[PDB]
């Protein structure tokens, strides 16, 4: 996260770290959506242009974390993966359309002050909140600058951007399964996701019921915090029927 700040303790208790077993390293962010299911970006697990194709046994998920590098004894919980599910129409060839994946844990994780699931949006919450100018919150342990790394989880609040502005910022084909967020050059304020934040959540706090909803997944961007560029996020609600199908059948 570029131009963010240190998270408060327990501020994002649905935050998940995807952790490579060997070599031990951060792979991506992710989010907890129930005691057995973790949501992330498909490109965190499968990206053939970079020879990336992780299997269940390559990975762990670390939940309840704050420090990036420490083993947070008595606080974090480390879980093994039972199965990965990648969206069947994830488009890694062109533009990361449908950049979404689910990971089922081998055993349910115990909730705590530091470990708690985020809600997924319904149609009405998505319609009300996914409007240009409305701000969401992005969290992760990724790089602090494009070209360095944080001691603890970082957080930044960013406004959703009008779709024509998103499209006009890039040569990539933008789809209805994506939205973009970030400040414009003349808005003064700054902030973006960066390498390592991939797969983490873009959340919004509903003013109707005071619950946090995951509206986006950190998907891609052109540089980190570049003027005139925006971060792109997977549109969770648009892919929710697939989410439900996977969970209701596995």
């Amino acid at each position: 996260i570029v131009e963010g700040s240190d998270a408060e303790i327990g501020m994002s208790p649905w935050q998940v770290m995807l952790f490579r077993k060997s070599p031990q390293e951060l792979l991506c962010g992710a989010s907890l959506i129930s005691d057995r299911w973790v949501l992330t970006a498909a490109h965190c697990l499968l990206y053939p242009p970079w020879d990336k194709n992780f299997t269940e046994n390559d990975l762990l998920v670390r939940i309840g974390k704050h420090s990036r590098t420490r083993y947070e004894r008595n606080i974090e919980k480390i879980s093994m993966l039972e199965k990965i599910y990648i969206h069947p129409r994830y488009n890694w060839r062109e533009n990361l359309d449908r950049d979404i994946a689910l990971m089922k844990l081998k055993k349910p994780v115990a909730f705590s002050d530091y470990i708690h699931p985020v809600c997924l949006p319904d149609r009405e919450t998505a319609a009300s909140l996914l409007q240009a100018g409305y701000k969401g919150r992005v969290t992760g342990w990724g790089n602090l600058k494009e070209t360095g790394q944080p001691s603890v989880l970082q957080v930044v609040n960013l406004p959703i951007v009008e779709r024509p502005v998103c499209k006009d910022s890039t040569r990539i084909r933008i789809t209805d399964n994506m939205f973009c967020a970030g400040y414009k050059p003349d808005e003064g304020k700054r902030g973006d996701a960066c390498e390592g934040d991939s797969g983490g959540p873009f959340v919004m706090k509903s003013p109707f019921n005071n619950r946090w909803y995951q509206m986006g997944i950190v998907s891609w961007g052109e540089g980190c915090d570049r003027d005139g560029k925006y971060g792109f996020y997977t549109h969770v609600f648009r892919l929710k029927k697939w989410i439900q199908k996977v969970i209701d059948q596995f």
Binding site: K21, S22, Q24, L26, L60, T69, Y71, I78, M80
Partner: peptide
């Protein structure tokens, strides 16, 4: 530069 995790999770 990550602290070693308990070996029980890597087995």
């Amino acid at each position: 530069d990550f602290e070693e995790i308990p070996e029980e999770y890597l087995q």
